[PDB]
Design an enzyme around this catalytic site. Structure first.
Site, PDB file in Angstrom:
ATOM      1  N   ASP A  96      71.056  46.318  23.913  1.00 60.16           N
ATOM      2  CA  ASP A  96      71.538  47.603  24.406  1.00 60.16           C
ATOM      3  C   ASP A  96      71.077  48.736  23.499  1.00 60.16           C
ATOM      4  OD1 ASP A  96      73.589  48.506  26.640  1.00 60.16           O
ATOM      5  OD2 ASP A  96      74.030  49.732  24.872  1.00 60.16           O
TER       6      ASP A  96
ATOM      7  N   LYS B 209      68.264  52.145  24.410  1.00 61.56           N
ATOM      8  CA  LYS B 209      68.394  53.561  24.084  1.00 61.56           C
ATOM      9  C   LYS B 209      67.229  54.040  23.227  1.00 61.56           C
ATOM     10  CE  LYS B 209      73.433  53.141  24.193  1.00 61.56           C
ATOM     11  NZ  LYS B 209      74.709  53.349  23.455  1.00 61.56           N
TER      12      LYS B 209
END
Lengths: 358, 358
Positions: free
Chosen positions: A216, A220
């Site tokens: 995750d 980003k």
């Protein structure tokens, strides 16, 4: 006086906080919700595009969810400027973004599936968005929740600045783990102990390996890199050092992982004490280094007076060093949470409304 | 395909940095500069609204500048969406913003004179802006130059967040002196020697008392307070602790003031050395405290671990504590400079053009 149509596809507390902030919104442009999917099976909407009462949408008469093909035609037939609010992380809905954009539907989303897939999908979304009558795509909440990171970074690239270095702690759960574990003072706190208390406080999932693999975080970093000009192929195309020790990835259940993790605390204690011996703290960071031609996510060492060494709790931070900013632009704050994420989505949807409403 | 007309009013290094950034802009919206005022007496504009060549405006046939009432008529007669870029610090053009806005002309400026005056002028500008066909008013470059401060602060106020505490170092000049004069160590460096460096290093102007009275600091604090809901009457309505000693204000020469400043060098030495025993660092900050219902600008004691204790030279910093951000949003970086100020004006101009162009 100006107005836009809104279709909300949500699920959890982010969608609940978004609807509540939207219902209490006092803004010049008026929002009219015509489609609201409560779950993956129910949706509230009328054939005449009547406004969905946000105060009582939970008990309102519901129907089966319109498929994405039929939702597009439904929204197009209203002949109004419409915004799609994708408050999920659904990979299927994200795969439908190009269709939405061509049909003139704008998107405001915290979902980062479509922006951290292959590079071709990234180029496809914004090329159709730049085309005539293509929908606008605002996704500030995908990196740092409501923190002003993506917006200010796009203005930097648009006006001609050249970014050379992006450093950041972009995971709230992993920021909490390392801020609690590695400070400028001597400490005996164990890696497994802080992981276990972060799990039961709500920072890490019931199985922490989903957060500890850094994937995750890597999504980003991929988003910021592509905005900055570093055209990464995918979050799997660069080094992401998982915090899960290698001999513990095959374990199927979380209880077995939390039971065997403490036998690797000795390896982390020595590494933390080794960096403390040279007057540095450990941080799980993501780096977009144009100078080194490197994108990476992993543990790094920072001096005691470095801005990253003074992070408290689960605060996110991003450092943007550019040609016009020899000393980098630094933005820090809460990078996760239902309300701050809904604020980032609503702020994007308001910016879109100011540009397309009539 | 879409475009707006642009009238540029400027003077020195910021105006030339802005024109160069605008000349090399590759944006979806086209910018046709129909009026460019090089000096206070010469302007470049055509009867037929011909575009000004941004790479040769200096060596172009110039006319007399149009008076403000007549510049407005000239711009509105084109029947085109128009942005005025005010790259000055002139007080007469700032007084004319309500006339510009009511005529439908949008404004993007780093000039804070219109936003740091009486509260009645503030309300008048944004009421005519909110009215039908009123011009947009973007002024991000007034606080922190290109740092994303006013934008994010406006957004969270717009989505219903409640501000409760704003702290900030808003002067690159005053940030420098207090960083190289108050640390966690122990210094005999005295107040005059630090000022004498910036006295003739470009940080402080010809008269050092201009950047030591804190009035420009108070102007920026007034803007942030009014955005967040602390409707301040004027920068002279709250406490501003001028660094200039009162007996030294009467002198007419900045050199004569600096030579008698070492009379208080030991008094600031007493202030500095004592705060160190408390484990505190001295910083010149502006505060907007909603709980105490007070705005102030002056010296304050901060802890060693506080983010204000490790600033990179002349870096500005702003901290925004809200209901949704118990841990405050913190934004730091360069708060002055021609290129970063011009970037802040250009990004605002792009945001305006995205909303009004056709």
């Amino acid at each position: 006086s100006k107005s836009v149509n809104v279709a909300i596809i949500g699920a959890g507390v982010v969608s609940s906080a978004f609807i509540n902030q939207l219902a209490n919104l006092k803004a010049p442009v008026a929002f009219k919700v015509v489609y609201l999917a409560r779950s993956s099976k129910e949706a509230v909407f009328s054939k005449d595009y009547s406004a969905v009462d946000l105060k009582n949408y939970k008990t309102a008469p519901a129907q089966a969810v319109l498929p994405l093909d039929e939702l597009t035609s439904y929204l197009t037939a209203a002949k109004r400027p419409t915004i799609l609010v994708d408050n999920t992380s659904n990979s299927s809905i994200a795969d439908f973004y190009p269709k939405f954009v061509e049909a003139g539907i704008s998107i405001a989303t915290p979902n980062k599936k479509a922006f951290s897939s292959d590079l071709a999908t990234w180029n496809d979304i914004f090329k159709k968005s730049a085309a005539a009558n293509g929908g606008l795509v605002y996704h500030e909440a995908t990196v740092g929740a409501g923190l002003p990171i993506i917006g200010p970074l796009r203005d930097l690239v648009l006006t001609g600045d050249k970014v050379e270095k992006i450093e950041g702690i972009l995971s709230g759960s992993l920021s909490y783990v390392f801020n609690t574990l590695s400070t400028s003072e001597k400490s005996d706190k164990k890696f497994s102990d802080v992981v276990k208390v972060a799990k039961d406080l709500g920072y890490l999932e019931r199985d922490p390996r989903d957060d500890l693999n850094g994937m995750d975080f890597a999504r980003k970093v991929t988003i910021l890199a592509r905005i900055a000009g570093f055209e990464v192929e995918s979050p799997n195309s660069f080094a992401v050092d998982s915090l899960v020790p290698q001999p513990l990835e095959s374990l199927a259940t979380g209880a077995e992982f939390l039971e065997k993790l403490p036998e690797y605390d000795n390896d982390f204690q020595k590494r933390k004490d080794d960096a403390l011996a040279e007057n540095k703290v450990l941080r799980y960071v993501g780096q977009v280094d144009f100078k080194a031609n490197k994108v990476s996510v992993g543990i790094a060492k920072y001096d005691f007076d470095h801005p990253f060494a003074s992070l408290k709790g689960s605060d996110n931070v991003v450092s943007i060093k550019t040609e016009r900013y020899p000393n980098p632009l630094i933005i820090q704050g809460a990078g996760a949470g239902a309300e701050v994420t809904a604020h980032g989505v609503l702020a994007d949807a308001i910016k879109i409304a100011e540009r397309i409403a009539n």
